[PDB]
Amino acid sequence: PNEEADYLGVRIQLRREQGAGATGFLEWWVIELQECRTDCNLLPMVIFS
Amino acid sequence: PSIIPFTAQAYEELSRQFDPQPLAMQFISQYSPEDIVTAQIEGSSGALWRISPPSRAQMKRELYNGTADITLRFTWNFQRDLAKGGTVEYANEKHML
Amino acid sequence: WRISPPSRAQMKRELYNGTADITLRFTWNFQRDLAKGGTVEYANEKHMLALAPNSTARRQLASLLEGTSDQSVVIPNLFPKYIRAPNGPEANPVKQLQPNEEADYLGVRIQLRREQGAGATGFLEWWVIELQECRTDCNLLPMVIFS
């Protein structure tokens, strides 16, 4: 009911596999919910079809 | 598989969470447990970030030194089964901070 | 194959030590020209083999992830050669050409290609699939589609 103010905060991280050498950077982003307690690797989006 | 339909327990748990909001309960009561799905979106990006080194250097300059607002756009897009009916395969929208 | 190093380590653990069946899903999806007519742009379906715990195929696909073996895994019953693409999104295999259903599906030989560049752990990894009975053009999987 507060629209944007009821949307969950997202914790964003940059994962940077390098392989300990050179600038070969396997880079990808990870997102987590700010209040994750169980399954921080999952963002449960509840969809009413 | 990541798309999990609501169990009767998950529907009772959602109803409980929203029992204080009569407008939320009026909305929840319009949908069946089969109509509500949890998409368990994995929090690791399913693609490597292919950003060009000059695009990354520009993004870094725009984050530190950019005077204009940089729009963080979160988008969702739902593909549906046209063989189950309806005229629209893709339902999508965007949030923009 | 963009798989995260922890996802690859988990897949390797699930292939070697997983007690649950690991589902090998082969999917096909046919895009059609809506300007030629019909109401359905995409006709799709899925085959799903349960790779049983301790099975030969599950262990050989586990050893491929080690990159110590030039050995291909053969997975029987995986490739439906004959598929109907009907006016709807149910791209069903042809039970009239494959009367034993899964038992008339071609075996797929799977390989892991691992370009390294002779140095470090920079691993350009991708999978190759071949038909078990390929004689000519082993780099091609002829899927026969009845539209």
Side-chain angles (χ1 to χ4, degrees), chain A residues 1-10 12-16 19-49, chain B residues 1-15 17-49 51-79 81-97, chain C residues 1 3-31 33-57 59-108 110-114 117-147:
Chain A
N2 313 299
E3 302 190 25
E4 305 189 336
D6 294 332
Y7 295 0
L8 303 183
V10 179
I12 308 174
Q13 298 170 32
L14 181 67
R15 296 289 275 188
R16 282 168 115 227
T23 182
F25 258 123
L26 296 109
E27 298 188 355
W28 66 100
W29 300 78
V30 175
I31 64 173
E32 302 173 355
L33 295 176
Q34 174 178 338
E35 306 199 329
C36 75
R37 296 184 185 183
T38 50
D39 312 319
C40 286
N41 293 359
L42 301 180
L43 296 89
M45 181 178 285
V46 179
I47 306 166
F48 300 78
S49 210
Chain B
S2 0
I3 305 177
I4 304 180
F6 267 54
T7 66
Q9 291 173 336
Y11 191 96
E12 281 182 28
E13 284 168 15
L14 182 70
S15 291
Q17 188 201 346
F18 281 105
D19 214 29
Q21 250 85 349
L23 295 174
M25 288 306 293
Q26 282 173 8
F27 185 89
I28 292 160
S29 70
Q30 294 164 39
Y31 296 88
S32 337
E34 297 176 6
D35 302 317
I36 314 178
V37 304
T38 304
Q40 294 192 339
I41 299 149
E42 278 183 29
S44 292
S45 183
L48 290 171
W49 189 49
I51 190 166
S52 88
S55 300
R56 181 182 172 174
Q58 197 187 320
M59 179 191 169
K60 188 182 178 189
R61 288 174 196 152
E62 194 176 340
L63 285 164
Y64 277 114
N65 301 2
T67 49
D69 297 324
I70 190 168
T71 44
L72 186 71
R73 187 186 77 167
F74 184 69
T75 66
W76 52 92
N77 166 80
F78 308 144
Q79 190 183 12
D81 189 350
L82 290 180
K84 294 177 194 167
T87 51
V88 182
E89 192 188 339
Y90 296 95
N92 58 73
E93 193 47 271
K94 70 219 169 221
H95 189 30
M96 292 187 302
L97 286 179
Chain C
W1 189 49
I3 190 166
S4 88
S7 300
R8 181 182 172 174
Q10 197 187 320
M11 179 191 169
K12 188 182 178 189
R13 288 174 196 152
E14 194 176 340
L15 285 164
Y16 277 114
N17 301 2
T19 49
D21 297 324
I22 190 168
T23 44
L24 186 71
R25 187 186 77 167
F26 184 69
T27 66
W28 53 92
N29 166 80
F30 308 144
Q31 190 183 12
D33 189 350
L34 290 180
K36 294 177 194 167
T39 51
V40 182
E41 192 188 339
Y42 296 95
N44 58 73
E45 193 47 271
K46 70 219 169 221
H47 189 30
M48 292 187 302
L49 286 179
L51 294 177
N54 280 295
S55 63
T56 44
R59 293 188 191 136
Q60 286 173 334
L61 204 149
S63 61
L64 274 175
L65 294 181
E66 308 204 304
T68 47
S69 66
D70 308 308
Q71 295 182 7
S72 62
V73 61
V74 179
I75 305 195
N77 301 22
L78 183 64
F79 185 95
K81 181 178 172 197
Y82 302 105
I83 309 186
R84 186 178 173 186
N87 286 0
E90 260 227 78
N92 281 268
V94 185
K95 303 192 174 218
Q96 297 83 352
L97 293 167
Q98 300 190 274
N100 313 299
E101 302 190 25
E102 305 189 336
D104 294 332
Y105 295 0
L106 303 183
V108 179
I110 308 174
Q111 298 170 32
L112 181 67
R113 296 289 275 188
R114 282 168 115 227
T121 182
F123 258 123
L124 296 109
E125 298 188 355
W126 67 100
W127 300 78
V128 175
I129 64 173
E130 302 173 355
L131 295 176
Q132 174 178 338
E133 306 199 329
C134 75
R135 296 184 185 183
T136 50
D137 312 319
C138 286
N139 293 359
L140 301 180
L141 296 89
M143 181 178 285
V144 179
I145 306 166
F146 300 78
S147 210

